[PDB]
Amino acid sequence: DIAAQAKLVYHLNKYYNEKCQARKAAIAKTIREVCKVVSDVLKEVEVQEPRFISSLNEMNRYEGLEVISPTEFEVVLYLNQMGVFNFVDDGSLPGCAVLKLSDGRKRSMSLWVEFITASGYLSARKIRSRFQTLVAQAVDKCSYRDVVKMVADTSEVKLRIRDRYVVQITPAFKCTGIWPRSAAHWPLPHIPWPGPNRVAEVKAEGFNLLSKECHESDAWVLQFAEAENRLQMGGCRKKCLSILKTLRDRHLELPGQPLNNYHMKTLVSYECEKHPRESDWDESCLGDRLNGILLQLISCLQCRRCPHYFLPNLDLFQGKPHSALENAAKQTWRLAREILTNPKSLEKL
Numbered sequence: 001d002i003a004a005q006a007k008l009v010y011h012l013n014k015y016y017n018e019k020c021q022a023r024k025a026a027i028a029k030t031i032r033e034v035c036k037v038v039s040d041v042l043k044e045v046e047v048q049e050p051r052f053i054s055s056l057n058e059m060n061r062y063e064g065l066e067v068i069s070p071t072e073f074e075v076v077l078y079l080n081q082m083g084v085f086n087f088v089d090d091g092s093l094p095g096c097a098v099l100k101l102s103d104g105r106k107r108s109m110s111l112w113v114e115f116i117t118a119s120g121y122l123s124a125r126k127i128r129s130r131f132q133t134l135v136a137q138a139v140d141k142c143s144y145r146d147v148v149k150m151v152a153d154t155s156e157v158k159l160r161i162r163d164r165y166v167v168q169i170t171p172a173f174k175c176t177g178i179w180p181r182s183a184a185h186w187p188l189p190h191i192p193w194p195g196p197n198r199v200a201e202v203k204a205e206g207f208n209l210l211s212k213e214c215h216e217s218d219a220w221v222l223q224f225a226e227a228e229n230r231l232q233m234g235g236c237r238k239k240c241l242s243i244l245k246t247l248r249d250r251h252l253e254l255p256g257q258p259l260n261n262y263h264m265k266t267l268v269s270y271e272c273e274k275h276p277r278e279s280d281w282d283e284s285c286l287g288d289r290l291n292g293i294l295l296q297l298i299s300c301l302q303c304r305r306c307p308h309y310f311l312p313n314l315d316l317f318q319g320k321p322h323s324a325l326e327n328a329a330k331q332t333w334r335l336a337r338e339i340l341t342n343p344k345s346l347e348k349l
């Protein structure tokens with residue numbers, strides 16, 4: 001039985017060294033060709049409207065870029081601001097928050113003066129709509145125009161590149177020096193994880209406010225990309241996450257798109273709360289952690305509920321038909337059974 005647990009760890013590491021490493025290289029190649037199209041479209045916007053500056057810093061990754069699928073991405077476009085707005089998060093719009101002007105006048109003081117309502121709120125929808133018109137003009141004018149169209153029938157700004165890749169470009173503001181009320185419960189009082197030292201840097205990472213749709217209202221959607229990534233450092237956590245994203249790409253890309261990489265990302269964080277010790281994420285525990293996550297994934301699909309890690313009131317399955325979730329449970333179960341029954345199957349997965 002030690003041989004079987006050891007056998008699972010061995011073949012998972014081969015899977016990580018082979019399929020996961022190839023996946024990282026292939027997506028990096030796709031990201032490279034997709035971002036130079038995005039940079040050309042965005043630099044066309046910025047000449048027409050300098051407030052939309054391209055925050056595509058390669059820094060060695062592209063800041064603000066998130067992978068959803070081997071062919072789908074989201075670029076977070078961070079907008080300069082003066083800092084005249086107050087962050088307001090009551091639970092009136094779950095998973096959302098609002099930016100209000102600090103006192104009555106000084107609307108002239110803001111860079112986005114025309115987008116502040118009479119009530120004094122900075123409108124996410126008005127900013128995205130203006131941004132959409134600018135992008136729709138850029139994709140007809142830029143050098144790459146033959147390979148970029150803009151996706152239709154959506155209020156989101158999405159570029160379809162070479163009829164293969166889809167990129168959502170989401171305007172956003174970075175919020176530092178504040179933790180949101182909707183996330184103030186975290187970290188849980190009892191759970192040994194993370195270390196209080198780790199919590200203080202995660203909260204120092206801040207959070208983002210994104211202009212996209214969710215659930216009329218027009219508020220900003222909360223997002224914790226940078227906090228999430230700092231949270232999952234240490235041990236084999238990220239190696240586990242990479243294996244999950246790879247298995248999902250190759251075997252759980254299903255009709256209706258019930259599962260995406262962010263589901264895997266959320267489950268790893270919850271598995272960290274269920275196993276808070278650093279020794280639970282030792283390299284020898286890689287098989288136990290992956291098994292626990294896959295079974296946890298099956299439970300979420302069967303229960304029709306997969307809560308957001310920082311915003312437990314939010315369900316990451318909301319809007320997905322139960323037939324698609326049930327199909328994903330049946331495929332995830334059969335996948336987890338094959339891996340556990342014979343880890344050598346990973347060679348051909």
Ligand SMILES: Nc1ccn([C@@H]2O[C@H](COP(=O)(O)OP(=O)(O)OP(=O)(O)O)[C@@H](O)[C@H]2O)c(=O)n1
Nearest residue numbers: 024027028031061062063065066067238242245
């Ligand atoms: N902002 C980003 C995100 C991704 N990538 C590239 O795309 C690959 C796949 O990213 P991801 O879906 O997050 O898979 P991971 O296994 O998590 O890659 P990593 O461990 O490097 O984060 C990464 O290896 C990285 O090289 C990038 O260049 N810039």
